[PDB]
Amino acid sequence: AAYYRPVEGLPPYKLKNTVGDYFRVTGEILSVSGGVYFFFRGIQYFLQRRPSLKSLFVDSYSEILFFVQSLFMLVSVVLYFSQRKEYVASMVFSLAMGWTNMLYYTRGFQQMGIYAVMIEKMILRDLCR
Amino acid sequence: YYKGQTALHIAIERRNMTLVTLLVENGADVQAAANGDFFKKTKGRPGFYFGELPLSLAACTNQLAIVKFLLQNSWQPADISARDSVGNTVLHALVEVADNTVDNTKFVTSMYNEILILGAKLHPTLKLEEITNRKGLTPLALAASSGKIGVLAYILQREIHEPECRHLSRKFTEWAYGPVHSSLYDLSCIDTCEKNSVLEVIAYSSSETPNRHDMLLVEPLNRLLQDKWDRFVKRIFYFNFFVYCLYMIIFTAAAYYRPVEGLPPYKLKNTVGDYFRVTGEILSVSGGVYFFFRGIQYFLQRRPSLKSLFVDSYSEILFFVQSLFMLVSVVLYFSQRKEYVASMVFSLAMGWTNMLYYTRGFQQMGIYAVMIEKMILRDLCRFMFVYLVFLFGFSTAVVTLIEDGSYNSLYSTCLELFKFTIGMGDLEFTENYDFKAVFIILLLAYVILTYILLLNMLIALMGETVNKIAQESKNIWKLQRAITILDTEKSFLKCMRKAFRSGKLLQVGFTPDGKDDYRWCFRVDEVNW
Amino acid sequence: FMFVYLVFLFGFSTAVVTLIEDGSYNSLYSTCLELFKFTIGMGDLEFTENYDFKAVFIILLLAYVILTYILLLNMLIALMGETVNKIAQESKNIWKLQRAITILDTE
Ligand SMILES: CCCCCCCCCCCCC(=O)O[C@@H](COC(=O)CCC)COP(=O)(O)O[C@H]1[C@H](O)[C@@H](O)[C@@H](O)[C@@H](O)[C@@H]1O
Ligand SMILES: CCCCCCCCCCCCC(=O)O[C@@H](COC(=O)CCC)COP(=O)(O)O[C@H]1[C@H](O)[C@@H](O)[C@@H](O)[C@@H](O)[C@@H]1O
């Protein structure tokens, strides 16, 4: 849906009598639905735990990252309807994080999960130094 | 169900010697058909994998009194050679129960020696140790195939220094000169047992045997493999390496000087170069066919499963795949196509790469190549997923961020972001495009995540893996040399028997019958005090 | 090392040079050079244009880069690390011997 976005100015953009626009808008709707789902999952996670700052940013990274992805997607929706071009700038960030968040699923696979958690720990303990 | 669980079985099982003695004296039979589904193998489910014979229970429970008591029954004598549903005897039972631990090895070794010597004394005419089960395995071959390294280590070098018992020994010390001792090993059924020798079963296992790497380190087998290496296999292997190198050179020369016209085939002329070229092509295709049939012969003589095919025998697969590519090239060459070049070059690249197969037989090079193979298989399946996730995510992000009425394609952007791995990234490969700050942020985030963090983590993890495979590489190289030796002697291309060790040497000169014995003893010199 | 590396370099050099030909990078020396450059961080990935079987050419180069640049050159570092960790004392012994030889010759 993102890669085939239109290249005109000042969204939103209307559907035509072709078939491509229907596939594109279908993809956009499914994408935004996914973003909303992850938004509410993040809220449900927070409410059922209520961790503090000293526990929130040292644990539960994956939930934070998925929530952040959904935030970017929603900001993109707001800008898309708000007659702005910058909806692109938010959307791509979400897209990038979305693909990166694929690594969350390496858990459940022994070797891949050990590899991915080692990478996460060598990111947190490293860049700050 | 617990079919055949007679009172004697329970008395032995509960370690109640009083009940066992009373039941045996009362006339309880030994040949119990303890064939209940509980008493069968497949111990993963609830069951008892070494039943179907009370002698098997008596020996497997480490109680010498019961087995010594059943030698001379009051009513019905026991028979050590009694066989269960799958042909296993007491000795096979003693092999199967082992778990390769020091204490268990001590108990199983003790019971094995005692039961074997008692059976020999009771029936000197019967060679209990040579009896095979339904699969055609002796207890030695069973221990080797199944993975019972401890029992194998015992059996291959057991000895008894007593009159009328030394003839059962494997190891001897016939001569000594002060500190020097000239040990002998009979080593029957190691070089050949006419169906399945110890080396054959260890080397050609299904890869599930836990100790196939460690079994070849034992005292007699390592020396045998070294002797066969030094004797004749070294020369044949180096000769094969030389011939293969010449084959690859001819193939490369044929490929490089291919014609540059369209729509093959192309006819010979009255010049001289065309004859050399077509000669090289014919030799190349002949080599491809040879490797094709070698691959098939390897498959048919093994029939491994998918879970064993793609975790073992990589070299045979690679040589076969080379053959497939060359044959596809031949088909396209005659089919009036240009695409034969593609398959030919893939074959050529794989042939030169497969040149590394021959580093076995050279100590340091072979260890090096084994480490490379293991650190390819273990590392790419872990690394490339992570790397491709990052590359694809940022490629799609950048390519969908930039667009005009040149880098509008995901392929080109994937390439330009790949270049950052090989030290040729630009950091500026577009201009006047919208959202310049976002573009720069994305590229810098990609560079930090991939170039600065991920590749260095790859190096560090490869360091750890290297530290943890110093020994597995040595064992695997020894195993590869073992495979080479066994294959070379098995084929040998002349139908000659050169695998013999020392001839029919008069090791013992004694049997229970009034006869001598020749046992193909192999000599080993050692020095100690 | 150089045996393994030269096997890879020569195999892929011959593959690429026999894949491309016309009536500039069509010689074995130049192609061996251009594939050597990938070790020192100056590979192009696109050093020929309009040549037949573009997909095969790209597959070959990418396979070469992965096999050599990303796996082999890093493995060299890892193995050197192991050997360096394991020759720390042998180095001291050999240096003492070298000084002993120097002393004996001078005396
Ligand atoms: C603009 C473009 C930006 C792209 C940014 C990309 C960031 C890197 C992406 C990293 C991908 C992996 C991932 O996203 O998942 C990782 C989190 O990696 C990070 O730390 C990112 C730091 C930043 C695991 O997440 P998790 O929530 O499982 O953490 C575990 C807890 O669950 C558990 O209770 C335990 O406490 C355990 O010790 C915890 O680890
Ligand atoms: C288009 C261009 C593509 C070029 C592709 C090139 C691939 C890399 C080339 C690798 C060169 C080395 C080689 O080809 O030989 C290696 C195999 O390397 C690989 O794994 C390649 C993975 C892929 C050893 O082969 P081998 O059959 O001896 O395996 C041993 C068994 O014999 C033994 O029983 C034991 O199980 C032991 O643990 C096993 O190791």
Curated annotation (Swiss-Prot), chain A:
Cytoplasmic topological domain residue ranges: 48-60, 107-121
Cellular compartments annotated: Postsynaptic cell membrane; Cell projection, Dendritic spine membrane; Cell membrane
Residues that coordinate or bind resiniferatoxin: 61-62, 100, 107
Effect of residue 100 to I: Reduces sensitivity to capsaicin 10-fold; no effect on sensitivity to resiniferatoxin. Reduces binding to resiniferatoxin
Extracellular-side positions: 4-21, 82-85
PTM text: Phosphorylation by CAMKII seems to regulate binding to vanilloids. Phosphorylated and modulated by PRKCE, PRKCM and probably PRKCZ. Dephosphorylation by calcineurin seems to lead to receptor desensitization and phosphorylation by CAMKII recovers activity.
Expression (tissue specificity): Predominantly expressed in trigeminal and dorsal root sensory ganglia. Expressed also in hippocampus, cortex, cerebellum, olfactory bulb, mesencephalon and hindbrain. High expression in the cell bodies and dendrites of neurons in the hippocampus and in the cortex. In the brain detected also in astrocytes and pericytes (at protein level). Isoform 1 and isoform 3 are expressed in brain and peripheral blood mononuclear cells.
Modified positions (Phosphoserine) in chain numbering: 52
Result, substituting residue 97 to L: Reduces binding to resiniferatoxin
Membrane-crossing residue ranges in chain numbering: 22-47, 61-81, 86-106
Protein's job: Non-selective calcium permeant cation channel involved in detection of noxious chemical and thermal stimuli. Seems to mediate proton influx and may be involved in intracellular acidosis in nociceptive neurons. Involved in mediation of inflammatory pain and hyperalgesia. Sensitized by a phosphatidylinositol second messenger system activated by receptor tyrosine kinases, which involves PKC isozymes and PCL. Activation by vanilloids, like capsaicin, and temperatures higher than 42 degrees Celsius.
Further remarks about this protein from its record: Responses evoked by capsaicin, but not by low pH and heat, can be antagonized by capsazepine.
Record family assignment: Belongs to the transient receptor (TC 1.A.4) family. TrpV subfamily. TRPV1 sub-subfamily.
Domain remarks: The association domain (AD) is necessary for self-association.
Complex and partners: Homotetramer. Interacts with PIRT. May also form a heteromeric channel with TRPV3. Interacts with CALM, PRKCM and CSK. Interacts with PRKCG and NTRK1, probably by forming a trimeric complex. Interacts with the Scolopendra mutilans RhTx toxin. Interacts with the spider Tau-theraphotoxin-Hs1a. Interacts with TMEM100. Interacts with PACS2.
Identification of the protein by name: Transient receptor potential cation channel subfamily V member 1
Gene: Trpv1
UniProtKB/Swiss-Prot annotation, chain C:
Domain of life: Eukaryota
Entry's localization field: Postsynaptic cell membrane; Cell projection, Dendritic spine membrane; Cell membrane
Annotated phenotype, changing residue 34 to Q: Slight modification of pore attributes
Impact noted for substituting residue 46 to Q: Minor modification of pore attributes
Transmembrane segments: 1-20, 56-84
Motif (Selectivity filter): 41-44
Intramembrane region positions: 25-47
Residues the record lists as binding Na(+) 2: 41
Mod. after translation: Phosphorylation by CAMKII seems to regulate binding to vanilloids. Phosphorylated and modulated by PRKCE, PRKCM and probably PRKCZ. Dephosphorylation by calcineurin seems to lead to receptor desensitization and phosphorylation by CAMKII recovers activity.
Binding site for Ca(2+): 44
Residues recorded with modification Phosphothreonine: 102
Residues covered by region (AD): 82-107
Annotated consequence of substituting residue 37 to E: Restored channel activity
Tissue: Predominantly expressed in trigeminal and dorsal root sensory ganglia. Expressed also in hippocampus, cortex, cerebellum, olfactory bulb, mesencephalon and hindbrain. High expression in the cell bodies and dendrites of neurons in the hippocampus and in the cortex. In the brain detected also in astrocytes and pericytes (at protein level). Isoform 1 and isoform 3 are expressed in brain and peripheral blood mononuclear cells.
Domain description: The association domain (AD) is necessary for self-association.
Quaternary context: Homotetramer. Interacts with PIRT. May also form a heteromeric channel with TRPV3. Interacts with CALM, PRKCM and CSK. Interacts with PRKCG and NTRK1, probably by forming a trimeric complex. Interacts with the Scolopendra mutilans RhTx toxin. Interacts with the spider Tau-theraphotoxin-Hs1a. Interacts with TMEM100. Interacts with PACS2.
Miscellaneous comment text of the record: Responses evoked by capsaicin, but not by low pH and heat, can be antagonized by capsazepine.
Family to which this protein belongs: Belongs to the transient receptor (TC 1.A.4) family. TrpV subfamily. TRPV1 sub-subfamily.
Protein name in the entry: Transient receptor potential cation channel subfamily V member 1
Part of the whole protein covered: 580 to 709 of 838
